[PDB]
Design a protein around this ligand. Structure first.
Ligand SMILES: CCCCCCCCCCCCCC(=O)O
Ligand SMILES: CCCCCCCCCCCCCC(=O)O
Ligand SMILES: CCCCCCCCCCCCCC(=O)O
Ligand SMILES: CCCCCCCCCCCCCC(=O)O
Ligand SMILES: CCCCCCCCCCCCCC(=O)O
Ligand SMILES: CCCCCCCCCCCCCC(=O)O
Ligand SMILES: CCCCCCCCCCCCCC(=O)O
Ligand SMILES: CCCCCCCCCCCCCC(=O)O
Lengths: 238, 252, 29, 285, 238, 285, 29, 285, 60, 29, 29, 29
């Protein structure tokens, strides 16, 4: 017979190996494949779709739709801060968004992020807001002046209800860890009143805003891993 | 104008002067079953305009405390003219839909509805072991279900809108064909969905292919709350076809 | 089966069993 | 070229991502950053449209994010136990109604789609625990019993003859058993979810239990009774191959409670039932 | 030697594998093959041949040829029901027919079924009967009117003694399980008096009918499995 | 093309089934639904002739229903036992008159034909039970003794030399033994049934025992007597290869009672002896 | 024996032993 | 020629060294032996310039001195211990934060460069010590848990399902497990040294611990509790493949004390802390 | 199957062997390589650079 | 992959796995 | 040694060792 | 390496490792 040399690794079972194996059902012919709308070939397709950020997930709001909305109203002090969160795609509150959940199945991420905001006040309610992205190496901005020195978008509310702020990939390394790691913490995104929330008389004095997130054309995930956003603490029975 | 829309189906025409474009589920327009994908061998019946027309359901009232509403298809149309008759006289049915949700208010009103079409929306029960949602509860008809009202029962399905009534987070429903009715922008939503299933045709009596879910994500508010703000749903089958004729099935 | 390619860099895509289910992971696209 | 495509496979550069092009300052009545989420579409704005970008050549690839890759990893779906305690004849064999609903990790991944079609690679990891000291010579038999075939009721049941069913015999000391199964459904794809019943009455079953019958896995220690008692645990691993998936959906946000159902439990403090971590307030990062 | 990697599965014995093995009798030359009439190359050949349905298999008839016949006679009430059975190829009473037995060696089936009926009364006995197939999703018809709304054949007894009713493949899925499963229960086939059984005087007032079953050109079985229509409860000795 | 036929083998699409064509309403004096079963022929009527059918492209294949497939699955035909109780010399070897009549599952399948010709793949699964604790080093010898060759009467009989007979030696820990046997009959095909005798008197034998002599399988534990007693059970599996079958027949409807004979037993309530389930009446589904 | 085919998709039908009985399952038709 | 280069690989003559040429007496105002080390350059003077050399054909090759060769030898980087003492559930599993800082031999070689890029071949050598006599049937599971993935806290933790993580299962008696890992960094090369922090305060971490997170290796004895206790020690070996290195540096001159840091200890007599051997005086060889 | 003869050495692990092995991270694409000054391809490069001799290394 | 060379001294540089990390030591230069 | 034949049915008579005594049974005639 | 010869009696002198020391016994003369 052909002389062979059994190499280390032989006989082992690696869950990620790619070998061939005999079929238990020889001659079996699978059901003809029919056309079904909605086929997905790559998870990137799902990362490119906006999903809502549970940005207002304080303990009293979790378990309520209100955990997804941010309230705006007439201010008495100028340049007030509206919200502030980390930009890290798998950090909280971004973690449970679809892109955050998918990112949690990988170890590395890269690319630019797309944050969108839809104003939901009356059509006669006006407002100008400043959305800013603060690259790392510094703490979150403590004022609007400090925040606008970074990347930002001044949003004017009007006929078009939604605005988008892109968080460009500004990193030392080509990739970052998806799990909360100092060295690769991507920065912050804050929101401030640019002018003020204004309404005519007989109009509600508060309004909600919805927040979305998705990845830009350069978004990419790497190194598959199990997620820590879901667990099993007992047997799943019949 | 891109703010306007006119949808004509059979003997019905619907209009809206403040739309937010329209959505075509998964980018596939409804179409009849082809012989390459078909399995049932009898010739299908295609009612055409007598079934592919807009059927308007019972309207619902939206108020500051509303938690949402949902309907299931084809169940919601089980008692709607020729379409309804056909789904009970035949074992198999197949159809696409044009869903037009209507809700006008005033320019001094504010509120936001998330309108979603979910394929295979398999509902959950809460804290009831392996007991699943009973047939009767997932087949409410044109009345649909008003979230937050139904007086509990063992086979009663989940009523948690934030968990999509199935153990997943509301914020991610946007991955399904959807639109928003943001009162300051539009007074209607339009979604055209194709037939979606792992089989070419199916029982319209025991399998609901799509579920229409409407959740008010932003509370209805105004300074004239006495004026009732309804939500009306009009659905038009598309390319409806049926196979396996016999006597009319009677449920219950 | 051997799907022998040529370029010399010859590619030998071998299928050791007679059932489609037996082969390894699919190519992308 | 089937050889150029080969090189891309080895280097994992089949699906490349777009480069970022240099952009410049702009002043226009065309405002890409403004749109309307009400449409149900995602704004297609890119970084070049909101800031002045430099030109950068992307080297990232999406290969690993493919559906084949995502679901193409072998994970545990069952842990079969044959524990010899006091009756060899009764404890030396068992059965399992096959499904991918009992282990959270792989179940959640597949359930991120509504339908999926794929062949399956089953790998088995048997481990014999010597409760009394020795293991002797352990030979196992794993028989796939499709729905309808006779299920063995004793360790010497005639059904173990396996005249037609597929059986895999493993001998302690030999490599882990493994075989492939072709897409098994009577339909075009497997239902990850099913909003339907097996009838139209208050007592009809609901969900995937109606459509996902895969038969039974019957096991037995082939070796006859030995002096020393053992506990054989066979862990079953599944990997999808030649995969296709349709209609993505929201990931499971709460723990699973039962098979073939989306049912869940909620405590008095719901924030403990989801992965969401309570924020102090809107401005506390 | 050639470096090799022993893959998982090696050394195992799968009853359905397709490997080669050394011959214990080298150089042995098998007996020349001669022509024998009746060769079978595919079991479908056997599924296409009619065999009798033990349709009248009540406890008192089993063990008697009468279990294969259905009695007809002059009726006093109109549109009376003659018989009713499930169409499922491996269900009872179809189970022990040849096609039912073969179907019991497989897990899935598809295609159309051919049911035939041969009248065996005197040549002067006349009769018209209605054979109906009720597709699933509804209970068995409770009357002739209810039954004829489905697929059917009105059979007129005459010079030609036999009629055939084809049960077309009307299913949601491309295949169905052969074993009794709700989701894939194919429906019913019922028989009713269309007019009445009529005879001249001095002629027997009852007559028998034989029932056959076989598969049409589209019939097909899939996924081999052991049968539950036969068992062994003890050793078969010499 | 030997390469196009190759693709059909991998996809299992060698034998395709006909499509259903569209049909239309008809009014004719040609009545396909009417025929005469007395002829002994099956009416060849198809669905297009009785209803108005649509056009449907069939994708089903008959490959798995082929005779090669049906009889090409390895099933148990014998379970040899060597149980060391109190005398190693007498209990360490045994013999079996080879046949495919002792296990119901495979016997019934082959008996669905009158004649069959095929080569055989024999796979053996030995399992050593440690009755006293250890198994030591077990080496087995399986010798095929064709009719006429000397049969061993002791564990050290000269016949074990196997100077001409084929013997397979297996060592505990090594993979399962397996070998092929060519079609063995002195005739053109094996008789599944034989309506004949080996003579013409009241004492002549009847049936396949007359034509199906396959010789004997003689086994022994090669290892000499060890302190600890073991029970070695070797299960023999058979699979037909390169198969041909003739004259199909009714499937066995009652349990088998003995080898090489169609004899059967009947109880007082015959419906218990057959798979037929009593119907309440003619109209109760 | 190697029954090498060509199409490039080369088929290698190999018979490792010198007896017909040794080969695997037969082709259909 | 890809075949001529092949011959050089087999003979290990890819990188040849220059010959020595014949030289002659010289009298010139060009003095190669004189230079200025202040420039930071090495005088390029060769033997032919300082003495009268003969012609000699060099046959030496530098292949073995290549970076691939130098770092391409498998060395131990970890010795995992699973010692069953009195609690199987707690002692049958463990974890290790992966790094190449714990074993001096390979660490010193890699640290002769500032940056290095390479794929890794991991080979595992498990050895089961029978503390009570038997080892039974030992099956091990080694799971690679990238940073972020759930770390098991019990031997039956759901994370062992390994639905996405890569796991290697080894069975006692089978060959040593081995697999390859591709260059893992989020950067272009691994940092052997890092003069930086993970922040800008007095409490920020310093060194490679900031940049070299490789995740965790989680192990467990898959086999359930056995009567006889064992001590399983799995030694992990690493070998660099397809290697590149940049900016060579001084070799480690004192013992290492901790991981990811250049810290060291000094005694009262420093000559004992370095490999330098005290000379009696300048002229004592 | 192909008849084979397992040769001595099989199954052993020699730290200096040069075999291939399956990749634990299939489909993974490594970070693009960038240019870094100072690459070393052979240790001879380091042997050709002068370093100081601790020639006066008496104990004191 | 098989990088077959020719000269007759044929060189068969075979890559048994589909990932670059899986191959053996690199060539020099 | 490989005594490759051609007809396409290619025959590969391989001799794995370098001694005549090592080969299998002889051909007849 | 494969030193393929031709005559048809093809000779396949294969060297499985990349070091000269690894090959078997030398030829004579
Ligand atoms: C032309 C030289 C013969 C080389 C031997 C081929 C070894 C590969 C056998 C793999 C067979 C796969 C089945 C075919 O198709
Ligand atoms: C011996 C076990 C057979 C191994 C398991 C094969 C699983 C493949 C079927 C996948 C279908 C998924 C639907 C479900 O959740 O039940
Ligand atoms: C060591 C056992 C040899 C294995 C058994 C070979 C069986 C092949 C003969 C088949 C002939 C069938 C007739 C019969 O029922 O006896
Ligand atoms: C032309 C390249 C030589 C390839 C080596 C062939 C390996 C396959 C050997 C199988 C021999 C089968 C017997 C012949 O016929
Ligand atoms: C299961 C263990 C994975 C085996 C270890 C892989 C090591 C490769 C990374 C090399 C990076 C060197 C930087 C360091 O000192 O930490
Ligand atoms: C032309 C004769 C077929 C010879 C059989 C080839 C055996 C080598 C298989 C190695 C496959 C590596 C993957 C490719 O690329
Ligand atoms: C042309 C392709 C190379 C195929 C590899 C050949 C494998 C067979 C090696 C047998 C060597 C026998 C000695 C010679 O002669
Ligand atoms: C052209 C067909 C490919 C045949 C596969 C070759 C198997 C032999 C591999 C031996 C490699 C030795 C290294 C070279 O040189």
């Amino acid at each position: 017979g052909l002389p062979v040399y059994v190499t280390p690794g032989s006989g082992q079972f690696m869950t990620t190996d790619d070998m061939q194996s005999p079929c238990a059902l020889p001659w079996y012919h699978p059901t003809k494949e029919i056309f079904i709308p909605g086929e997905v070939k790559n998870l990137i397709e799902m990362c490119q779709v906006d999903t809502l950020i549970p940005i207002n997930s304080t303990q009293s709001n979790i378990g309520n739709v209100s955990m997804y909305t941010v309230t705006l109203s007439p201010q008495t002090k100028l340049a007030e801060e509206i919200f502030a969160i980390k930009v890290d795609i798998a950090s909280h509150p971004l973690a449970t968004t679809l892109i955050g959940e998918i990112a949690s199945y990988f170890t590395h991420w890269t690319g630019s992020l797309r944050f969108s905001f839809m104003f939901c006040g009356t059509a006669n309610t006006t407002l100008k807001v400043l959305l800013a992205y603060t690259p790392p190496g510094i703490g979150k901005p403590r004022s609007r002046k400090e925040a606008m020195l970074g990347t930002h978008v001044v949003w004017d509310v009007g006929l078009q209800s939604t605005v988008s702020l892109v968080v460009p990939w500004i990193s030392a390394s080509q990739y970052r860890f998806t799990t909360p790691d100092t060295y690769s913490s991507a920065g912050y995104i804050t929101c401030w009143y640019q002018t003020n929330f204004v309404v005519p008389p007989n109009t509600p004095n508060t309004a909600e805003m919805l927040c979305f997130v998705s990845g830009c054309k350069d978004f990419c995930l790497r190194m598959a891993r199990d997620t820590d956003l879901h667990k099993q603490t007992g047997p799943i029975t019949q | 104008s891109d703010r306007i829309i006119q949808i004509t189906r059979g003997d019905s025409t619907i209009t809206s002067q403040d739309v937010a474009n329209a959505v075509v589920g998964y980018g596939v327009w409804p179409h009849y079953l082809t012989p390459q994908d078909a399995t049932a061998i009898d010739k299908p019946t295609q009612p055409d305009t007598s079934s592919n027309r807009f059927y308007t359901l019972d309207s619902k009232m939206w108020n500051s405390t509303s938690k949402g509403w949902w309907w299931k298809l084809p169940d919601a149309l089980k008692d709607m003219g020729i379409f309804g008759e056909n789904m009970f006289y035949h074992f198999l049915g197949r159809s696409g839909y044009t869903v037009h949700v209507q809700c006008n208010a005033s320019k001094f009103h504010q509120g936001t509805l998330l309108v979603v079409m979910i394929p295979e929306h398999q509902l959950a029960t809460v804290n009831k072991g392996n007991v699943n949602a009973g047939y009767k509860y997932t087949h409410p008809g044109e009345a649909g279900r008003e979230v937050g009202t139904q007086v509990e029962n063992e086979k009663q399905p989940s009523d948690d809108n934030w968990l999509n009534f199935d153990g997943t987070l509301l914020g991610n429903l946007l991955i399904f064909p959807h639109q928003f009715i943001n009162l300051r922008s539009n007074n209607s939503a339009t979604l055209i969905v194709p037939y979606v299933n792992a089989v070419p045709m199916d029982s319209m009596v025991r399998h609901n292919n799509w579920s229409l879910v409407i959740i008010p994500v932003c509370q209805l508010q105004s300074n004239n709350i006495s004026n009732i703000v309804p939500i009306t749903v009009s659905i038009s089958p598309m390319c409806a076809e049926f196979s396996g004729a016999r006597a009319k099935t009677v449920v219950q | 089966g051997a799907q022998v390619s040529r370029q010399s860099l010859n590619y030998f895509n071998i299928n050791y069993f007679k059932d489609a289910a037996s082969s390894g992971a699919s190519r992308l696209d | 070229n089937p050889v150029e495509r080969y090189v891309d496979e080895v280097l994992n550069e089949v699906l490349v991502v777009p480069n970022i092009n240099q952009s410049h300052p702009t002043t226009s009545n065309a405002a890409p950053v403004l749109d309307a989420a009400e449409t149900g579409h995602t704004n297609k704005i890119q970084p070049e449209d909101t800031i002045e970008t430099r030109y950068v050549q992307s080297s990232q690839t999406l290969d690993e994010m493919s559906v084949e890759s995502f679901l193409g990893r072998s994970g545990c779906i069952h842990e079969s136990v044959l524990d010899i305690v006091d009756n060899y004849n009764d404890q030396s064999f068992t059965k399992w109604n096959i499904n991918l609903q009992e282990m959270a990790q792989i179940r959640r991944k597949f359930e991120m789609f509504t339908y999926a079609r794929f062949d399956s690679e089953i790998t088995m990891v048997p481990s014999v625990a010597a409760k009394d000291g020795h293991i002797g010579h352990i030979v196992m038999q794993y028989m796939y019993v499709p729905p309808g075939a006779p299920i063995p009721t004793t360790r010497d049941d005639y059904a173990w003859q396996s005249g037609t069913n597929a059986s895999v015999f493993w001998q302690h000391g030999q490599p882990f058993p493994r075989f492939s199964l072709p897409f098994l459904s009577i339909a075009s794809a497997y239902y990850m979810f099913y909003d339907g019943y097996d009838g139209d009455t208050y007592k009809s079953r609901y969900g995937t239990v109606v459509t996902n019958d895969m038969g039974t896995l019957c096991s037995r220690i082939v070796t006859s009774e030995q002096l020393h008692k053992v506990k054989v645990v066979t862990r079953i691993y599944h990997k999808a191959k030649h995969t296709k998936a349709w209609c993505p959906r929201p990931p499971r946000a709460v723990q699973y409670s039962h098979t073939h159902t989306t049912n869940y439990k909620l405590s008095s403090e719901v924030h403990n039932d989801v992965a969401i971590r309570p924020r102090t307030n809107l401005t506390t990062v």
